[PDB]
Every structure is written in structure tokens, then in C-alpha cells.
């Protein structure tokens, strides 16, 4: 769970800030 | 192996930049890395702190559950710069934790690690785009 938690929140941000330099 | 080498020193050079304060393509990624590696730092301090709690890392050479979150960040089957800078800069937060600890440590297993990752298991994503000019063209502000 802590790994997952861990890798969720930082795909969530990848992904935010991805989208952020994409536009 | 260039790439791995050239990888290995944009973000060893990072991350230890970032843990201690203190060719043009490389130097290109890393003025990119140190621009966005900060940049994706803020507004999520609050969530790399609570990532750093748990995580737990013991040590400089402790990488296994960083090597376990970055694979399963990509399980996904998405590969992106952005995922891969907040992964780079995660590891920076980590280091810049492990040197505040123990002022001797090392930032090299992690940035090992780190490279390992992204190196091994996208290397024909990255050989595709020429490598870290993908990167900087991504992250290229004019
Ligand atoms: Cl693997
Ligand atoms: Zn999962
Ligand atoms: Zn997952
Ligand atoms: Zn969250
Ligand atoms: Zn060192
Ligand atoms: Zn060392
Ligand atoms: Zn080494
Ligand atoms: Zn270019």
C-alpha cells in the first residue's frame, strides 16, 4: 500500500505536470 | 553506453545540486532539469513530504522501494517527461532528505537507481526522440 500510494500520487502529478507543458 | 552515461550525469549532477545546494546537450537537459525539477516541486511540497514519510528510505544505498514505485508509476503503460521529471525531482527531495540526515551521504545509489529505471525499461522510448532532447524540447519556454 505505501508504495502505491507513493506511485499514485506521483503519476498524478507527472501526468498534471505533462499536461501542463503540453498545452 | 552513452545514453546511460549521459543520463546518469544530468541526474547525479541534479541531484546532487539539489541535496547539497552547492556535452552542451547535457548541459541543455540539465539547465531544463533544474528549471522543472524545482518547478514540479511547487504547490506539491506538501505531497513529497508525506511521499518521503512514506517511503522510509534507511539510507543512501536504501533504493529497492523507489526502483518498486518509478515500475509501478509506469504499469500504466504511459511514458511522459512530465512523469519522468516529477520521478527525477521526487529523487532529489529524497536526497536532498538523506543529506539532512547524514551530511556524508551519497546521492549516487539513488541517482543510479533512478537512471537504472528510466535507462533499462524506456530505453528505446528515449533512443526514439534522441534521448534528453525530447526533454528539452517538452520543456522548452521561449
Ligand atoms: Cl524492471
Ligand atoms: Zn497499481
Ligand atoms: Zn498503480
Ligand atoms: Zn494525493
Ligand atoms: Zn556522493
Ligand atoms: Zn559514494
Ligand atoms: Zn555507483
Ligand atoms: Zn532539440
Known amino acids: 500500500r505505501p508504495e502505491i500510494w507513493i506511485a499514485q500520487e506521483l503519476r498524478r502529478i507527472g501526468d498534471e505536470f505533462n499536461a501542463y507543458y503540453a498545452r | 553506453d552513452d545514453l546511460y552515461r549521459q ?3 544530468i541526474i547525479s549532477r541534479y541531484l546532487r545540486e539539489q541535496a547539497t545546494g552547492s556535452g552542451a546537450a547535457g548541459r541543455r537537459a540539465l539547465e531544463t532539469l533544474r528549471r522543472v525539477g524545482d518547478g514540479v516541486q511547487r504547490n506539491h511540497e506538501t505531497a513529497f513530504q ?3 514519510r512514506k517511503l522510509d528510505i ?5 533504493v529497492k522501494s523507489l526502483s518498486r514505485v518509478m515500475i509501478h508509476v509506469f504499469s500504466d503503460g504511459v511514458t511522459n517527461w512530465g512523469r519522468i521529471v516529477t520521478l527525477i525531482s521526487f529523487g532529489a527531495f529524497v536526497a536532498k532528505h538523506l543529506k539532512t540526515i547524514n551530511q556524508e551521504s551519497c546521492i549516487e545509489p539513488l541517482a543510479e537507481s533512478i ?3 528510466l535507462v533499462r525499461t524506456k530505453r528505446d522510448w528515449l533512443v526514439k526522440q534522441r534521448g534528453w532532447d525530447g526533454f528539452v524540447e517538452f520543456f522548452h519556454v521561449e
Not at chain 2, 534507511?58 to 536504501?62: A, G, I
Open chain 2, 7 to 9: 543520463s546518469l550525469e
Open chain 2, 58 to 62: 534507511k539510507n543512501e544505498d536504501d
Open chain 2, 50 to 52: 508525506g511521499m518521503l
Open chain 2, 115 to 117: 537512471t537504472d529505471v
